[PDB]
Design an enzyme around this catalytic site. Structure first.
Site, mmCIF file in Angstrom:
data_model
loop_
_atom_site.group_PDB
_atom_site.id
_atom_site.type_symbol
_atom_site.label_atom_id
_atom_site.label_comp_id
_atom_site.label_asym_id
_atom_site.label_seq_id
_atom_site.Cartn_x
_atom_site.Cartn_y
_atom_site.Cartn_z
ATOM 1 N N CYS A 146 15.624 -6.322 -14.224
ATOM 2 C CA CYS A 146 15.173 -5.754 -12.917
ATOM 3 C C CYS A 146 16.273 -5.592 -11.878
ATOM 4 O O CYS A 146 16.914 -4.521 -11.895
ATOM 5 C CB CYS A 146 13.915 -6.447 -12.367
ATOM 6 S SG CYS A 146 14.205 -8.254 -12.094
ATOM 7 N N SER A 147 16.525 -6.571 -11.006
ATOM 8 C CA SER A 147 17.406 -6.327 -9.848
ATOM 9 C C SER A 147 17.886 -7.608 -9.153
ATOM 10 O O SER A 147 18.536 -7.557 -8.112
ATOM 11 C CB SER A 147 16.680 -5.448 -8.832
ATOM 12 O OG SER A 147 15.374 -5.945 -8.629
ATOM 13 N N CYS A 148 17.542 -8.747 -9.743
ATOM 14 C CA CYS A 148 17.819 -10.080 -9.154
ATOM 15 C C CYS A 148 19.253 -10.163 -8.745
ATOM 16 O O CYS A 148 20.112 -9.715 -9.517
ATOM 17 C CB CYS A 148 17.359 -11.144 -10.149
ATOM 18 S SG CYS A 148 15.681 -10.573 -10.668
ATOM 19 N N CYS B 90 21.305 -8.036 -13.659
ATOM 20 C CA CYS B 90 19.918 -8.351 -14.014
ATOM 21 C C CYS B 90 19.405 -7.258 -14.940
ATOM 22 O O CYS B 90 19.041 -6.169 -14.498
ATOM 23 C CB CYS B 90 19.021 -8.452 -12.768
ATOM 24 S SG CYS B 90 17.325 -8.981 -13.103
HETATM 25 CO CO LIG Z 1 16.102 -8.493 -11.088
#
Ligand SMILES: [Co+3]
Lengths: 219, 201
Positions: free
Chosen positions: B109-111, B106
């Site tokens: 972000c961090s998905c 991602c």
């Molecule tokens: Co993310």
């Protein structure tokens, strides 16, 4: 928003250091911060798009210096004030203005069912699909100051639609109180050369990105 | 030469107190329930993790009908084993083959697919991995000890929307007639992100 969070293609961040046998939570305070998110989402205090964009708007150095859950902590301390759920004074003092004036939506009886169900961003109806799999598309050159999910590294670039996932909420509007404006999301395939040029590429490699219908135009 | 921006840098000295202060505030206003929050923590500490994805993979390896269902509808497929929910509502399973190696990231972000892999490790969510994985996947995989043949295509999937990806790695040779449980033991977290391969017997 062309901010420090849009990392794709950046240089200078170094080796991917990884901790051997990393625990789920490295510090006790992380447990608290993590568990707050579902609690506050359940209240409907903000949506996830707003949550993402609050992090995007934290200071660039703050973003780089802070460990992951410090990002979340930032959102709770700031987005809750912007939404009018807390006051800046309450946040600074840690002391509520006037007693238990709310009831938690996330209670022990519903935790398991809520975590097992989640909340899909898929929607039944929305704008019609303009593209079919196999279509060549170009990502529009847009540079909004608000929330968007077209990474900078894809803008102006040409790729191939390889999946139509169906209709989803549009984050660009949902993060800014402008409604869901549901439309199709496609996976788009780009060649390494198209994204990074002849020198920085490998002939075999491709990058797939999920992009909304109105991020695109026919190539 | 300290950690600075790799996800493992030291947090501020007063962070625990800051966190407690906010928590007391939210509890006092009636916004959050501490007992429910403990259940959330217990869920991600002890119940949800990569052992879930590993079962999904093992079953697909031994059951071609399940594999086909899983590839047609990832969400329904993982639900057959009782996995579902937050951050895995719309799953897409990426089959590795002799021609294609899949890996996801991602960049924004961090998905990450919580219901099958649990919460992501710190490195997955930090700038080094996120910045470099889409431009130089081979250089990043090499840091993990993973060298993909030059003639094998690498597909990097950037999780920019609300689809979540999990990699179905290739079954190792030397595992004829292995039970699902023995196969599952070979399936590492890295092999389901695409940053490693399953353990070879
Ligand atoms: Co993310």
């Amino acid at each position: 928003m062309n901010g420090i969070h849009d990392t794709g293609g950046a240089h200078g961040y170094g080796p991917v250091y990884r901790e051997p046998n990393e625990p789920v939570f490295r510090y006790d305070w992380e447990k608290t911060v993590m568990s707050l998110l579902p609690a506050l989402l359940a209240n409907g205090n903000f949506n996830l798009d707003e949550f993402r964009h609050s992090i995007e708007r934290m200071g660039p150095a703050h973003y780089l210096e802070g460990t992951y859950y410090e990002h979340w902590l930032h959102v709770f301390e700031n987005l809750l004030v912007e939404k009018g759920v807390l006051t800046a004074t309450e946040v600074a003092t840690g002391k509520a203005a006037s007693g238990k004036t709310a009831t938690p939506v996330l209670t022990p009886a519903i935790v398991d069912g809520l975590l097992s169900t989640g909340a899909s961003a898929a929607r039944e109806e929305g704008a019609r699909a303009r593209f079919a799999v196999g279509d060549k598309v170009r990502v529009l050159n847009k540079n909004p100051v608000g929330h968007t999910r077209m990474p900078r590294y894809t803008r102006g670039k040409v790729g191939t639609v390889v999946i139509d996932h169906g209709v989803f909420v549009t984050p660009d509007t949902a993060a800014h109180g402008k409604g869901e404006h549901p439309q199709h999301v496609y996976t788009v395939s780009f060649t390494s050369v198209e994204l990074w040029g002849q020198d920085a590429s490998s002939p075999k490699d491709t990058i797939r990105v999920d992009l909304w219908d109105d991020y695109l135009e026919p190539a | 030469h300290d950690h600075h921006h790799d996800g493992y840098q030291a947090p501020p000295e007063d962070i625990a107190l800051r966190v407690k202060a906010l928590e007391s505030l939210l509890i006092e206003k009636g916004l959050v329930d501490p007992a429910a929050m403990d259940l959330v923590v217990q869920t991600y500490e002890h119940k949800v993790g990569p052992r879930n994805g590993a079962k999904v993979v093992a079953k697909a390896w031994v059951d071609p009908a399940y594999k086909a269902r899983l590839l047609a509808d990832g969400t329904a497929g993982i639900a057959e084993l009782g996995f579902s929910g937050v951050q895995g509502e719309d799953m897409v399973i990426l089959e590795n083959t002799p021609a294609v190696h899949n890996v996801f990231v991602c960049t924004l972000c961090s998905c990450y697919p919580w219901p099958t892999l649990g919460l992501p490790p710190a490195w997955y969510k930090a700038a080094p991995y996120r910045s470099r994985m889409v431009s130089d996947p081979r250089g990043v995989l090499a840091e993990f000890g993973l060298v993909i043949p030059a003639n094998k295509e690498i597909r990097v999937w950037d999780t920019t929307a609300e689809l979540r990806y999990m990699v179905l790695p290739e079954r190792p040779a030397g595992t004829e007639a292995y039970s699902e449980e023995q196969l599952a033991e070979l399936v590492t977290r890295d092999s389901m992100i695409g940053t490693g391969l399953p353990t070879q017997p």
